[PDB]
Amino acid sequence: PIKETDKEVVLTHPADETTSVHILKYGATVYSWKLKSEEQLWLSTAAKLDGSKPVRGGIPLVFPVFGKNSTDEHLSKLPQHGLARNSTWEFLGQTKENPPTVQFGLKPEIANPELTKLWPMDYLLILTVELGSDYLKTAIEVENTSSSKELKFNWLFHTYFRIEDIEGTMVSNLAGMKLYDQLLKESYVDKHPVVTFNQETDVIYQNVSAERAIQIVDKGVQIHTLKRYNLPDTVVWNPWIEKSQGMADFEPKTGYQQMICIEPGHVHDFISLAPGKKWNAYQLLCK
């Protein structure tokens, strides 16, 4: 079933109503995904769901810039992570009853007014959210609706996975991959067989294909699996103690212990889309 309210859309799986996803129209932000009653995403207890600022948790959408840009004339004018996550998307309706599937849209005319003036590029976004019995798929299509100008952008899904304890968690299937370390400001190959956590980390793994599933493991159990299509980068982020303290809408301050962000995207460089042309990708979350 699908249920629309003024602020959100909620999908429940027809075989089991305790499997659900809640999507805020603001940012088209998934902020809860329950699998048979069990919450799969981390959301700050102080997250704003009222459209006052981006949602701290769930799956914020990152477009058209990942991070803060300094050198592009127009992208450098935008705040960190762009304008998709602070614009109210239009619910386009349901496309399927089983698996329950819905679409959301954004275009300059309905996007964040201040930010649209800073970056007045033509585009159309369509987000498709599909709720399976044992997975969540979030797919994106971007269309360059200009007839003359190329459209230059990054795309990233800022997925916050919920875990029990970051220090006892590991992430597998990234051994031997190249990364850019945003904290150290250097690139290197990750030579370790798994990723483990003891401090702030902010790394961008590269060359991750549709064939390379990433697993999050706790007490020997794969508690989360992430697959993707057409998103060659993966950001791995945890704020740790100090950064968490500084984030006003991040609570509890120990909350970094129950989250890990593993964020598929195209962020190592910009996609340049010719006029009239389309680009598409998705991420797929399961257990």
Residue nearest to Na ion (CB): 248
56 is in an annotated binding site: yes
80 is in an annotated binding site: yes
Q: Residue 158: what residue type?
A: H
DSSP single-letter state for residue 99: T
Q: Using the rule CB under 5 A, give the single segment among 77-85, 184-192, 235-243, 244-252 that binds Na ion.
A: 244-252
DSSP single-letter state for residue 273: E
- Of the pair 241, 248, the CB lying nearest Na ion is at 248
The Cβ of residue 213 has, within 10 Å, a number of other Cβ atoms equal to 15
**Alpha-carbon separation of residue 101 from 42, 95, 180, 193 (angstroms):** 22, 5, 35, 37
245 is in an annotated binding site: no
- Of the pair 53, 107, the CB lying nearest Na ion is at 53
Q: Among all residues, which ones are annotated catalytic?
A: 158, 263
- Of the pair 255, 265, the CB lying nearest Na ion is at 255
Q: Using the rule CB under 5 A, give the single segment among 159-167, 184-192, 211-219, 246-254 that binds Na ion.
A: 246-254
Q: Count Cβ atoms within 10 A of the Cβ of residue 71 and give its class: 0-12 exposed, 13-18 middle, 19 or more buried.
A: exposed
- Of the pair 183, 248, the CB lying nearest Na ion is at 248
CB of 251 to Na ion, least distance (A): 5
For residue 197, give every residue at least 6 positions away whose Cβ sits within 8 Å of its Cβ, in sequence order, or none: 166, 167, 169, 238, 260
For residue 211, give every residue at least 6 positions away whose Cβ sits within 8 Å of its Cβ, in sequence order, or none: none
Give which of 54, 231, 235, 51 is closest to 153, Cα–Cα.
231
> In the window 248-287, what residues touch Na ion (CB under 5 A)?
248
Please give the span between the terminal C-alpha atoms of the chain, in angstroms, as a whole number. 22
CB of 225 to Na ion, least distance (A): 32
Element (H, E) at 246: helix 240-246
CB of 60 to Na ion, least distance (A): 18
- Of the pair 55, 151, the CB lying nearest Na ion is at 55
Q: Using the rule CB under 5 A, give the single segment among 47-55, 164-172, 225-233, 243-251 that binds Na ion.
A: 243-251
CB of 76 to Na ion, least distance (A): 29
258 is in an annotated binding site: no
Distance CA(59)–CA(216), nearest Å, equals 17
Contact 168/218 with Cβ under 8 angstroms?
yes
Q: Using the rule CB under 5 A, give the single segment among 105-113, 219-227, 231-239, 247-255 that binds Na ion.
A: 247-255
CB of 84 to Na ion, least distance (A): 24
How many residues bind Na ion (CB under 5 A)? The answer is 1
Known binding residues for substrate: 56, 80, 85, 202
Residues that bind Na ion (CB under 5 A): 248
